[PDB]
Amino acid sequence: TTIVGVKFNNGVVIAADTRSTQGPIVADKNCAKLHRISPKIWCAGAGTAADTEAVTQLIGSNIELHSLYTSREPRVVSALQMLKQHLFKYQGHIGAYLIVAGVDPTGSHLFSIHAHGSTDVGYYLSLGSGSLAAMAVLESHWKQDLTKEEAIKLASDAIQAGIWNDLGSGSNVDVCVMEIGKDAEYLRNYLTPNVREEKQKSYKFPRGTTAVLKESIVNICD
């Protein structure tokens, strides 16, 4: 997995590759690692895939309830405090590593959370097996006060580093842009540089090829 977060002058962008693996094997060639906690607070995870999704949804559900109750737009510091306190309680057994990013009435925010429940803040971050490839790009090109365009380019490039050099990452680049003024934009398969080439031959079989022992219709209704 390669996930990055990058702050720009008026917002925050996150991005991720689209490959899930069971050890050496590629399960999903185009899964979605970008998760919504609330409309303008988004999330990318690495580690135990079930864990990052569950902890995101639990906290997403409680953040919705908090917002309704308080009549206020959810804050990124709340997602953080709830995630970190939850993860801490489970003493790393919930293997969630997350980059959490958003805009709220207080401004724009970029945070990291580790499975034991420690958090950090910064202007640029990476996580995942591709984390070193992506950080090397970030450390090479990140400047203070980037425009929106530059930030998308830099994040996109960081994910590419992970896609090309980390065997744990591959396929596509997903992006989400959270600007202070606006609605969050989720950009699914913003880059697709790993198209499978056309096969050399068609493997469709002549009908009758398979030997059938017996047969019957299956009843669905009642």
Partner 1 sequence: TSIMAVTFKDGVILGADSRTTTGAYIANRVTDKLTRVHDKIWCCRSGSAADTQAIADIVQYHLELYTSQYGTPSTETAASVFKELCYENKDNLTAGIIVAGYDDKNKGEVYTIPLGGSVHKLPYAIAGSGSTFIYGYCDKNFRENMSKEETVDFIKHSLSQAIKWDGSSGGVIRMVVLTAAGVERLIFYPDEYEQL
Partner 2 sequence: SDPSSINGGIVVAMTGKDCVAIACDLRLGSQSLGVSNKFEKIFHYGHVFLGITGLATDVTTLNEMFRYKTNLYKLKEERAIEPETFTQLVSSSLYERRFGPYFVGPVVAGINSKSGKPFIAGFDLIGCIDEAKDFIVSGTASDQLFGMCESLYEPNLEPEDLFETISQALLNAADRDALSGWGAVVYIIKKDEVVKRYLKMRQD
Partner 3 sequence: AGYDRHITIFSPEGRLYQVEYAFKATNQTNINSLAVRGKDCTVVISQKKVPDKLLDPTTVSYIFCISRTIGMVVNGPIPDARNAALRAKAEAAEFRYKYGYDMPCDVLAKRMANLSQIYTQRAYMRPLGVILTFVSVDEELGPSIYKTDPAGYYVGYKATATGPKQQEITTNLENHFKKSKIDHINEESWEKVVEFAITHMIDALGTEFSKNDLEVGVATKDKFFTLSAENIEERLVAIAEQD
Query: Mind telling me the catalytic residues?
Result: 1
The residues that touch partner 2, with contacts defined as CB under 8 A, are 20, 22, 25, 27-32, 48-50, 53-54, 93-94, 199, 202-207, 209-218, 220
Helix 131-141 / helix 148-165 crossing angle, nearest 10 deg: 140
Enter the tokens of residue 101: 């990013």
Closest by CA position to 174, among listed 222, 162, 219, 112: 162
Give the nearest distance from C-beta 216 to partner 1 in angstroms: 58
Closer CB to Mg ion, 45 or 170, in the complex: 170
Closest by CA position to 191, among listed 68, 18, 35: 18
**Residues in 138-177 that interact with Mg ion by CB under 5 A:** 163, 169-170
When binding is defined by CB under 8 A, the residue of 57, 85, 147, 189 that contacts partner 3 is: 85
Give, in order, the Cα–Cα distances in Å from 80 to each of 23, 33, 56, 76, 192: 30, 18, 11, 6, 31
The CA distance from 46 to 66, in Å, is 26
The pairing of strands 96-104 and 107-113 is antiparallel
Helix (H, G, I), strand (E, B) or coil at 21: strand
Q: Determine, following the binding rule CB under 8 A, whether residue 68 of this chain makes contact with partner 3.
A: no
Q: Using an 8 Å Cβ cutoff, are 168 and 23 in contact?
A: no
Residue span binding partner 3 (CB under 8 A) among the ranges 17-25, 65-73, 149-157, 196-204 = 65-73
- Pick what 28 binds: Mg ion, partner 2, partner 3, none; C-beta below 5 to 8 Å, kind-dependent: partner 2
- Pick what 147 binds: Mg ion, partner 3, partner 1, none; C-beta below 5 to 8 Å, kind-dependent: none
Closer CB to partner 2, 174 or 179, in the complex: 174
| Chain Cα centroid distance, residue 24 | 20
The CA distance from 95 to 28, in Å, is 20
The residues that touch partner 1, with contacts defined as CB under 8 A, are 84-85, 88, 91-92, 114, 116-122, 132
- Pick what 88 binds: partner 2, partner 3, partner 1, none; C-beta below 5 to 8 Å, kind-dependent: partner 1
Give the nearest distance from C-beta 81 to partner 3 in angstroms: 4
Can you give the binding site for partner 3, defined by CB under 8 A? 66, 69-72, 75, 77-78, 80-82, 85, 105-106
